[PDB]
Structure 1
Amino acid sequence: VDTCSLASPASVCRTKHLHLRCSVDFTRRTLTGTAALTVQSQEDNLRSLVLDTKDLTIEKVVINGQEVKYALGERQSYKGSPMEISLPIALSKNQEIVIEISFETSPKSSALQWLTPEQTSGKEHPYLFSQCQAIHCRAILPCQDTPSVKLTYTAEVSVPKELVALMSAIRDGETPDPEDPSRKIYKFIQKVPIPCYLIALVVGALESRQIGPRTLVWSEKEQVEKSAYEFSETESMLKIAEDLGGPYVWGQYDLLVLPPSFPYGGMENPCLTFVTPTLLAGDKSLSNVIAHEISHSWTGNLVTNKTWDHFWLNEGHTVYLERHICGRLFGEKFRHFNALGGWGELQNSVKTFGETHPFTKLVVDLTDIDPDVAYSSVPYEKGFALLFYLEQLLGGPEIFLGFLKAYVEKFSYKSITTDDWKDFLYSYFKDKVDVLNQVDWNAWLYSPGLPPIKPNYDMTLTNACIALSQRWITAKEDDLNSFNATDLKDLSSHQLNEFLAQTLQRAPLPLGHIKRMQEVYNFNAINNSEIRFRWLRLCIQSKWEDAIPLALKMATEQGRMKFTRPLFKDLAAFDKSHDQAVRTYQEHKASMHPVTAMLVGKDLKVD
């Protein structure tokens, strides 16, 4: 059962298609229109059905050209309000009908962020973007907001004519709005059935540049050139992913570089991956995020978790494919370096939550839990560690990649559970069932903490990071003069980031050590968001007051939760910056993404 949805389950009825006709009103901060759902009954004598909604105003529901009765139930916190619709005629099993709902969103819709012109790069036009994963589609339109249902969709979006709309779909033309010549209607078609969390919309002063045979990069004019260069390896990564997963079925693979408040590193919206502008490091070093979103075109978008309790299926397999893409491009020693880095992030998550915390389990129980509050590196890295351990146990990467491809082929266009995955793993590896039976399945899937076995990792690229981190940790005052810029001469940006992560695991360090690190390495000059984030956390945790303005600026000038949440938490934990962190959150709260504002408030204990 999907404990995060209040809608009728897939066993009662299934939405097959959505035809959305809407208009974006920037003056009211509302999306208004009609959602026409083609719904197929799965039961005999079906007379009503329930949809998910959250802060939606319903004007009317039309079936067969006439208004029908509906009722909105009491709100159930983050789940929203159930909408029960009374069907005019009882449906037989497999009968399909179209239900047209006229609705309008709330300006406080948790799916949307409305930006004023001052919040954009161009400063002249406003901007809107959505983020539906996990359960925010219900805050845009009435739907069965569960990944256990997959539907196709078509959309027609009216916007001010100076702006551009894009969606997680193939572009299907644009025309002036026949009802208003100051507006344009943009059309879209998504012919591959998707779960509704993959519905996405952006409206803004967007420009595009072609960077591959099936890829345009989209952003405001000021970021086009930098984005085209940053993401130039996209076609190469798509070709490797097709070799590992099978055909790319989505047609286009475009990228949208969002404003800095985009809450995630990337969102795998089909046909149009959304990415944070914090990837714009200038040297392509953060391109693993693109490899990750590309990989979701198979693991997540084609094979999907049936409920959010099985989210690790989506992320674990995607991290596994992501690391194979980067291993093909940069070598097997690089794949192991990134895999070992991932184990260290899993160590940090388990330490943060606590080793017995229910969110450190691979398969979770989200009954009465807001998915946004559960979100962490555990499903990604505990999921990856299980697959990497099975790869080692079952004969290596070539053999395990055969399983991955067969798994994608088996479950394409379906929504599955951990038991479906395990049953297929046992079926595919029938000649190695004795090896599979040695796995402690109960501990790996259902127990909290670090996994029961740590995989084997090549240490070649990690050794220099560990050695430099240990030199700093073990240094006394009289050793500080031995450090010098030459210590970093043979380290890649990835290795500098790993040196900082290793050191941050032992923070705090003495203030004099951190001051010496800035003296000889000049980490304050580095703009790479991952390195800067770890360096500023190391400074703040080591109680360097000089870092307070730098950390507050990074926390507020961008809104990627991976960076903003720990920076605000570190600033709140440092007595010297505590009041400033709380005051800065209070002043920026109204202008923040709604989910990020909620999570930073919980982290800071500010209501």
Structure 2
Amino acid sequence: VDTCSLASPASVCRTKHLHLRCSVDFTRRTLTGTAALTVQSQEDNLRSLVLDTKDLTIEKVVINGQEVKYALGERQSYKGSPMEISLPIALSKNQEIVIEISFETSPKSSALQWLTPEQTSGKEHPYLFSQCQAIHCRAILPCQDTPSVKLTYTAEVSVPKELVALMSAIRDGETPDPEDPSRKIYKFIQKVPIPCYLIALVVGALESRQIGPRTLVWSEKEQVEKSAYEFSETESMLKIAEDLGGPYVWGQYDLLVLPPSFPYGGMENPCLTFVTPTLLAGDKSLSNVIAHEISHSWTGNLVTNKTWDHFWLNEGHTVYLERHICGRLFGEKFRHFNALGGWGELQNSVKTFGETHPFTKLVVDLTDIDPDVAYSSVPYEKGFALLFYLEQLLGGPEIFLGFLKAYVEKFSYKSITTDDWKDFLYSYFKDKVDVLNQVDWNAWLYSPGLPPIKPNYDMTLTNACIALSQRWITAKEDDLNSFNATDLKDLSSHQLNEFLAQTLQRAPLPLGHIKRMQEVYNFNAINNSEIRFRWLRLCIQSKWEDAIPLALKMATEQGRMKFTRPLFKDLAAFDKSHDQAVRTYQEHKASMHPVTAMLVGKDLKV
């Protein structure tokens, strides 16, 4: 069972369907309406059940056309408050009923960011977006907020008529709102069973442009053209993903480019991937994020982690597929380059947390841990490393991709644990069980720190990055003159980024070295968010005061946590910028995404 949920477990009852009828009130920052849950008993004589909620106001609960008794328990910190509903008639096993709950969200809902007009591109209209993963769906509506339950859904959403609503679902029409002519009702259908963390909503002044046979890009009008170019490889990537994973079952694959405070690189919402506008580099160089979100259409959205302890199943396999997509497009040496970079990121995470820290285990125990606090690259990169190691052990990528496809087929529409995965691995590779038994499973799955074995990586594309980084680290003052813009002439953006990542692993460097780097390479002029991020961290860690305003700007003008959190941390650690970093956070806190505001405050000890 799921230690992050207060709701009745799947062994007691299962939600089969949600019909959501709601209205988005920008004046009050509330979503109001009804959640009708079709629930199937899994027990004889079922007389009550419990749902998760968080900062919800419940008006009433109706079953069979009458109000029923319910009770909200005391809040359990980040888990919210359990809601026990008294059923009017005891249910037999497999019996289904509909429970219609009237509710309103709180402006402080941790699932939602409410943006004022000034926080958008267009400056006229407000904007709302959700981000339920991992356990914030309970802050939008009452539900069994666990990925161990999958349900279909329909929705009707009333919004101001000048705005557009989109959900993780197929669009199913729009009409004027009969209860309020100033509004429109948008309708949605999701016919494929999903865990509730994949329920998503955006409302704003959105426009669309077609970019492939099954893909529209959506954004505010100011970003449509750039977005359409940036993500033009989307259909090519979908075709490759279908080859690797099997049929794409979700109908459409649309993309939504959010405002800059979107807290993550991407979210794999079914039918409508959400992405950060920090991907808009102008050259398609950050497209691996789209490859990642596409890949979730199989690993994560079809085969799902049963509880958050098993999150690496979602991410390790998705990164594995992501990197195969990149390798098919740009070659096997590039796959290895990205694989090796990911090991680098894993090294960073382990050093950050500490080599014995419980959040560096592959399988974690989130009992009494806020999921958002555990979140890091570990499940992505330790998960990927395990799969890449297994690929090498078991006879290579063609063989291992055969496993991947069979795994997706086996567990489609289900929620599974690490033991389910391992059992299937052993079944699929039964003729190589001797090889599988050579793996130190206890260390790989359950021990903290770096894995016991590092995979073999082709170094072809990495060599020049390491060599340049080593030149800088070993340079003395009299060597600085030798550096020149020609040093970079054969490096791709990816390689520039890796040179910075290598160098940042040894930071600080002497301030004179960093000043020379700007003199000869002009990294200040690079707008690629990944490069600028690493460059500004290197500058701040090396105590360059000139970089303070640049790093503060980047930290606040966008909100992707990958960048905002370490920039604020670095600025707080630099004595010269410490006080300004704290003031800047205090001043921005009220208008930050709620999860981002929480995590930055924790990082800064404020």
Q: Give the shorter-chain TM-score range.
A: over 0.9
Q: State the Cα deviation string for residues 451-477 of structure 1 (Å, max 9, x = none).
A: 000000000000000000000000000
Correspondence for 2:503: 503
> 2: distance between equivalents of 1:245 and 1:286?
22
Deviation at 1:431, TM superposition (A): 0.2
- How far apart, CA to CA, are the structure 2 residues paired with 1:430 and 1:416? 20
CA distance in 2, matches of 1:219, 1:492: 29
Q: d(CA) in 2 for partners of 1:275 and 1:179?
A: 34
- Partner of 2:352, secondary structure, is helix
SS state of the match for residue 250, structure 1?
Answer: coil
Matched position secondary structure for 1:103: strand
Equivalent position SS for 2:100 = strand
Measured after TM superposition, the shift of residue 602 of structure 1 is: 0.1
Paired with 1:22 and 1:216, the residues of 2 have a C-alpha distance of 25
Q: CA deviation at 1:288?
A: 0.1
Tell me the SS of whatever aligns to 2:290.
Answer: helix
Deviation at 1:544, TM superposition (A): 0.1
How far residue 348 of structure 1 moved from its aligned partner, in angstroms, is 0.0
**Structure 2 runs not aligned, ≥5 long:** none
Shift of 1:212: 0.3
Deviations 1:492-545 (A, max 9, x none): 000000000000000000000000000000000000000000000000000000
**Residue aligning to 2:561:** 561
Q: In the TM superposition, what is the alpha-carbon distance from 1:104 to its structure 2 partner? A: 0.1
How far apart, in 1, do the equivalents of 2:287 and 2:245 lie? 19
Deviations 1:539-573 (A, max 9, x none): 00000000000000000000000000000000000
Structure 2 Cα separation of the partners of residues 303 and 59 of structure 1: 36
Cα distance, 1:578 vs structure 2: 0.1
Q: Tell me how far apart the structure 1 counterparts of residues 17 and 178 of structure 2 sit (CA, whole Å).
A: 25
Q: What is the alpha-carbon distance in structure 2 between the residues aligned to residue 38 and residue 500 of structure 1?
A: 52
Cα distance in 1 for partners of 2:170, 2:579 equals 48
**SS state of the match for residue 52, structure 1?**
strand
Task: Please report how far the alpha carbon of residue 489 of structure 1 lies from its aligned counterpart in structure 2 after TM superposition.
Answer: 0.2
Residue 323 of structure 1, CA deviation: 0.1
Q: CA deviation at 1:26?
A: 0.1
Could you give the per-residue CA deviations for residues 423-461 of structure 1, whole angstroms, max 9, x where no partner exists?
Answer: 000000000000000000000000000000000000000
Residue 430 of structure 2 corresponds to 430
- Partner deviation per Cα, 1:304-329 (whole Å, 9 max, x = no partner): 00000000000000000000000000
Tell me how far 1:281 sits from its aligned partner: 0.2
Identity across matched positions, percent: 100
Aligned-partner Cα distance in 1 for 2:160–2:309: 40
Cα distance in structure 1, aligned partners of 2:329 and 2:103: 48
How many angstroms apart in 2 are the aligned matches of 1:362 and 1:247? Answer: 29
1:63 Cα deviation (Å)?
Answer: 0.1
Per-residue deviation, 1:291: 0.1
Distance, in Å, in 2 between the alignment partners of 1:235 and 1:76 is: 44
- 5+ residue gaps, structure 1: none
What is the CA–CA distance in structure 1 between the aligned matches of 2:378 and 2:20, rounded to whole Å?
35
Aligned equivalents of 1:379 and 1:432: distance in 2?
A: 26
**Pair 1:45-2:45 in alignment:** yes
> Displacement, 1:185?
0.1
Write out per-residue CA displacement over residues 117-172 of structure 1, whole angstroms, 9 at most, x where no aligned residue.
00000000000000000000000000000000000000000000000000000000
Aligned partners of 1:522 and 1:238: how far apart in 2?
Answer: 37
CA displacement at 1:10 relative to structure 2? 0.1
Q: For 2:62 and 2:251, locate their aligned partners in 1 and report how far apart those are by CA, in whole Å.
A: 34
TM-superposed CA distance for 1:18, in Å, is: 0.1
Equivalent residue, structure 1, for 2:236:
236
Structure 1 residue 90: Cα displacement:
0.1
Deviations 1:73-126 (A, max 9, x none): 000000000000000000000000000000000000000000000000000000
Offset at 1:51? 0.1
Deviation readout 1:354-395 (Å, 9 max, x if unpaired): 000000000000000000000000000000000000000000
Partner in structure 1 of residue 5 of structure 2: 5
The two structures have a TM-score, normalised by structure 1, of 1.00
Q: CA deviation at 1:35?
A: 0.1
Cα deviation for residue 39 of structure 1 reads 0.1
CA RMSD across the alignment: 0.2
1:365 correspondence with 2:359: no
How far 1:605 sits from its partner (Å)? 0.1
Query: Partner of 2:530: helix, strand, or coil?
Result: helix
Question: What whole-Å deviation, never above 9, does each CA across 1:41-88 have from its counterpart, x for those lacking one?
Answer: 000000000000000000000000000000000000000000000000
Cα distance in 2, alignment partners of residues 28 and 430 from structure 1: 59
Q: How far apart are the structure 2 equivalents of 1:263 and 1:576? A: 27
Q: Deviations over 1:548-607 (max 9, x none)?
A: 00000000000000000000000000000000000000000000000000000000000x
What's the offset of the Cα at 1:293? 0.1
Residue 456 of structure 1: aligned partner = 456
CA distance in 1, matches of 2:170, 2:459: 44
* Counterpart Cα distance in 2 of 1:418 and 1:310: 6
- 1:402: how far off? 0.1
TM-score (norm 2): 1.00
Q: Report SS of the residue matched to 1:435.
A: helix
Deviation per residue, 1:254-278 (Å, 9 max, x gap): 0000000000000000000000000
- Aligned with 1:262: secondary structure? coil
Measured in 1, the distance between the counterparts of 2:408 and 2:160 equals 41
Aligned residues: 606
Please give the secondary structure, in 2, of the residue aligned with 1:181.
coil
Q: How many Å apart are 1:29 and its aligned residue? A: 0.1
Output the CA distance in 2 between the equivalents of 1:16 and 1:147.
13
Q: 1:224 offset after TM fit, Å?
A: 0.2
**2: distance between equivalents of 1:380 and 1:311?**
9
Q: 2-side partners of 1:479 and 1:190: how far apart?
A: 62
Q: CA deviation at 1:401?
A: 0.1
Measure the CA separation in 1 of the matches of 2:525 and 2:38: 55
Cα distance in 2, alignment partners of residues 485 and 173 from structure 1: 55
- Per the alignment, in what secondary structure is the counterpart of residue 210 of structure 1? strand
Matches within 5 A, 1:207-218: 207-218=207-218
Paired with 1:408 and 1:178, the residues of 2 have a C-alpha distance of 44
SS at match of 1:121: coil
SS at 2:182's partner residue?
Answer: strand
What is the 5 A alignment of 1:127-526?
A: 127-526=127-526
Q: Distance in 2 between matches of 1:430 and 1:575?
A: 58
Secondary structure at the aligned position of 1:180 is classed as coil
In 1: Cα distance, 2:187 partner to 2:41 partner: 28
Structure 2: how far apart are the matches of 1:370 and 1:100?
Answer: 29
Q: What CA distance in whole angstroms lies between the structure 2 residues aligned with 1:434 and 1:218?
A: 50
Q: d(CA) in 1 for partners of 2:440 and 2:123? A: 56
Q: In the alignment, what sits opposite 1:585?
A: 585
- Once residues 436 and 246 of structure 1 are traced to their aligned partners in structure 2, the CA distance between those partners, rounded to angstroms, is 26
Query: 2-side partners of 1:21 and 1:31: how far apart?
Result: 10
User: C-alpha distance in 1, partners of 2:349/2:173?
Assistant: 45
Aligned to 2:106: 106
